[PDB]
Structure 1
Amino acid sequence: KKISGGSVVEMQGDEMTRIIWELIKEKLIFPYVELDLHSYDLGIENRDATNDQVTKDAAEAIKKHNVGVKCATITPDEKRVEEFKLKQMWKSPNGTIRNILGGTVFREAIICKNIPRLVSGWVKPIIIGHHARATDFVVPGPGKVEITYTPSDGTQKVTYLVHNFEEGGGVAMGMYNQDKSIEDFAHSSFQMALSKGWPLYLSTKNTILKKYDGRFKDIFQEIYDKQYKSQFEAQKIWYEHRLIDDMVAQAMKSEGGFIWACKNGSLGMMTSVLVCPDGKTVEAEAAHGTVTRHYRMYQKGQETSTNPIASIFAWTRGLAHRAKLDNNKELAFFANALEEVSIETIEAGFMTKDLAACIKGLPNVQRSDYLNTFEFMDKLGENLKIKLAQAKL
């Protein structure tokens, strides 16, 4: 009978994704798992009606229950405001959540043998985690641009000359970064390496930006030694700093299987995951958007061919983490079974137009080559039911 899921914060999105999102939930998740579901509706209309209140609530909920899976949501601009008569132009919910939760987002392309990688050497996937401010202005004519720092303890103020424009004009910039943000970026990155049981590489450019990127390299080591070095060995893992050039060269000549945290391939396969520093809280979401083009055709009754893998893994990565926290072996296994069924269904010849396009090039793609949105969800459901029954032994 059903699996004891636990508390999970689900968040519904917009357009095409919101549609495939309902199919995932009922076909691949519900028939097998029971969840204390804290479901919030981040549909643009509802964010409007509730004055974005809902978005904040949802972030507050994730903060509490540590686990949240999200559907792609419309981030509004001029065109959207007119499209929906939006009483205002609301901020990207991801942005809202990110500020309330913090942490570092990690992306990972799931790899199928028969999927033309951007380098045929990667049989194992590579998780990347960008760090995430700029005060730029224009210099009209001759003048002096300096960057000063005034300490709050009344200490001597310090002024650096960034450039002294003696003839023409130009442009200028100011950039910053608190220690707290770098620490959070480190822990996020270390814990992520542990969960995925893989090595952690920090690429930087502290040869030039000696003081700037230097701080990064330090903050990381200081943390990696005071903490996390022991556990890293407990899994044969290690953390090592590589200059941005050694990395990129090493990575191409690499078979993947590591976490790349740098300071700075189909989308239906890409999955973004926010990892809060505490190692407790996590949000998971597809990298792609709402796929509006597909949605348009869907509305007109036309046949659509959307890839649901990115969205599916948002659930499995979320659920996986839920199990992790709760020692739920039953759930832990289900997550896997689903991820596998997904990769396997594809490595068996069943896929959507976009994936088929990878193999035979967009033009040469005939209808017989791919499955549209529905029957592909079905195919996954079938294989899922199967795989699961097989495990019962």
Structure 2
Amino acid sequence: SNKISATGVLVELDGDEMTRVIWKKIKETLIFPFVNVPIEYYDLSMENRDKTEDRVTVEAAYAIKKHGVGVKCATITPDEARVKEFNLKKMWRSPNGTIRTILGGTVFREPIICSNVPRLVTTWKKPVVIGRHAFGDQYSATDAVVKEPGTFEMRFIPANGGEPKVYKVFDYKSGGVMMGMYNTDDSIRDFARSCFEFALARKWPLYLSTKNTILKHYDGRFKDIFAEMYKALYETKFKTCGIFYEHRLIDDMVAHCMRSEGGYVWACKNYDGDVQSDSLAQGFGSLGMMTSILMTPDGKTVEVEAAHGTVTRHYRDYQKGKETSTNPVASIFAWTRALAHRARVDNNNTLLEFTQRLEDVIIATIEAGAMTEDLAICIKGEKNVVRADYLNTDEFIDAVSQRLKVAMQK
């Protein structure tokens, strides 16, 4: 019972509403008792984001680049109703957006799985981790209606005074609609770097979906760039790891995902990752059972968080004194994942040990049958759920806490 320490620092980003109440508890019960982390702490509450005029958000991001690891609690992103609620003198940009620009990199969503908790998709046994390429295809396109008959044309004008090449796209007769989109080789090459680095670190294979049958050039450039890089830099390493990479056609990927056991990383384009991430996440079940995690292209800088929001509907009931059974595992797993990275970077196996315990002690505690209300509802259905079927949030943490001590051997 020597409490574990570290050698580098861990950047903590505190947040809002219900997840903050949960954050605080976790640190008191599942982290600070068992381990001493140096923590550079930025408070990203809405209150304190407003007070520093967002400066702490940016400060937090740069710290993550200096130090190399960050955990983030759910933070409210301000909108119109929020500016009236919290009296903000500015509608500040979503802190994730701010953070993500500065760090750069790609977001991987990895769900936590338990035996007894069933999935919507019977086949699924292991994580399917979708990486999403955020730099714009349709998200930075330029769209327009066509009210007159006429002709939609595309010019590529070379900057070295060279001859423009132009493209007949369509001659409309009645009305219509037109669009143009783009992407960079550098944005793609960074998307690729992230993916290869994540899947390698995780010791999973990597898939890539495109529709390159139809868009032989546009979607072709993705397939190629991944290929260029793979057999250059990654193929030997993956092959030592017992993993691989293949490009699949998007039509096969959805079918493969449907039919498959799982246990792989799925890298897909901006639009595809956006559409798929929601069905996929639904299918695995509770949003408390999944974590986000941005990974820069080098693979040394990581920001990690639960893939749910500040779960406000519950933060009301907590204010009103009512019992609440918000699921804390995604939050808890943000800590363990993030601390793991820290350990893997500093080559620190007492800390890397701890993270393995907690991760699996959580799965044990639910696998045995102690679970928050949402998981009960997967097993037992939404009618049928009685109070003895779920622990509330606080008594679940106290339940993983004892079970952790049990497995503090070594």
TM-score by length of 1: 0.96
Q: Aligned partners of 2:203 and 2:68: how far apart in 1?
A: 20
Q: Aligned partners of 1:162 and 1:99: how far apart in 2?
A: 34
Counterpart of 2:165? 158
Counterpart of 1:81? 83
Counterpart of 1:49? 51
2:267 is aligned with what amino acid?
A
- Mapping of 1:378-389 within 5 angstroms? 378-388=398-408
Counterpart of 2:281? none
Counterpart of 1:140? 147
Q: Aligned partners of 1:184 and 1:164: how far apart in 2?
A: 37
Counterpart of 2:330? 310
Counterpart of 1:356? 376
- Are the structure 2 counterparts of residues 323 and 77 from structure 1 closer, same or farther at C-alpha, using a change threshold of 3 Å? same
Which of 199, 217, 220 matches 1:211? 217
2:376 is aligned with what amino acid?
A
Counterpart of 1:254? 260
Instruction: For structure 1, list consecutive stretches of 5 or more residues without a partner in the other structure.
Output: none
Shift of 1:3: 1.2
Shift of 1:270: 1.1
Q: Aligned partners of 2:147 and 2:404: how far apart in 1?
A: 64
| Structure 1 counterpart SS, 2:78 | coil
The alignment covers a number of residue pairs equal to 389
What does the per-residue CA deviation read over 1:88-122, in whole Å, with 9 as the maximum and x for residues that have no partner?
11111100111001111001111111111122222
Work out whether 1:334 is the aligned partner of 2:335: no
1:296 is aligned with what amino acid?
R
Counterpart of 1:285? 305
Which of 103, 108, 112 matches 2:105? 103
Shift of 1:207: 0.5
Q: Aligned partners of 1:118 and 1:367: how far apart in 2?
A: 24
Counterpart of 1:186? 192
Find runs of 4+ consecutive structure 1 residues off by over 4 angstroms: none
Q: Aligned partners of 1:144 and 1:61: how far apart in 2?
A: 51
Shift of 1:160: 2.3
Q: Aligned partners of 1:101 and 1:139: how far apart in 2?
A: 40
What does the per-residue CA deviation read over 1:263-318, in whole Å, with 9 as the maximum and x for residues that have no partner?
13110101111010011101100000000000000001111110001111111111
Counterpart of 2:282? none
Q: Aligned partners of 1:228 and 1:16: how far apart in 2?
A: 42
What does the per-residue CA deviation read over 1:9-67, in whole Å, with 9 as the maximum and x for residues that have no partner?
00001000111001111110111111121110110111111111111111101111110
Q: Aligned partners of 1:60 and 1:89: how far apart in 2?
A: 22
Shift of 1:79: 0.3
Shift of 1:368: 1.5
Shift of 1:172: 2.3
Q: Aligned partners of 2:178 and 2:77: how far apart in 1?
A: 30
What does the per-residue CA deviation read over 1:206-242, in whole Å, with 9 as the maximum and x for residues that have no partner?
0111111100000000000110111011111111111
Work out whether 1:347 is the aligned partner of 2:353: no
Q: Aligned partners of 2:317 and 2:57: how far apart in 1?
A: 28
| Structure 1 counterpart SS, 2:171 | strand
Which of 276, 279, 294 matches 1:274? 294
Work out whether 1:167 is the aligned partner of 2:174: yes
For structure 1, which segment, 147-156 or 226-235, has the greater mean C-alpha deviation from structure 2 after superposition? 147-156
Work out whether 1:239 is the aligned partner of 2:242: no
Q: Aligned partners of 1:137 and 1:16: how far apart in 2?
A: 42
What does the per-residue CA deviation read over 1:319-361, in whole Å, with 9 as the maximum and x for residues that have no partner?
1111111100111111111110111111111111111111111
Q: Aligned partners of 1:20 and 1:311: how far apart in 2?
A: 8
Counterpart of 1:220? 226
Q: Aligned partners of 2:216 and 2:267: how far apart in 1?
A: 18
TM-score by length of 2: 0.93
Counterpart of 1:372? 392
Q: CA RMSD in A?
A: 1.2
For structure 1, which segment, 2-11 or 132-141, has the greater mean C-alpha deviation from structure 2 after superposition? 132-141
Q: Aligned partners of 2:234 and 2:22: how far apart in 1?
A: 39
1:335 is aligned with what amino acid?
T
1:319 is aligned with what amino acid?
L
Work out whether 1:149 is the aligned partner of 2:169: no
Percent of pairs with identical residues:
66
| Structure 1 counterpart SS, 2:64 | helix
Q: Aligned partners of 2:93 and 2:144: how far apart in 1?
A: 24
Shift of 1:158: 2.7
Shift of 1:260: 0.8
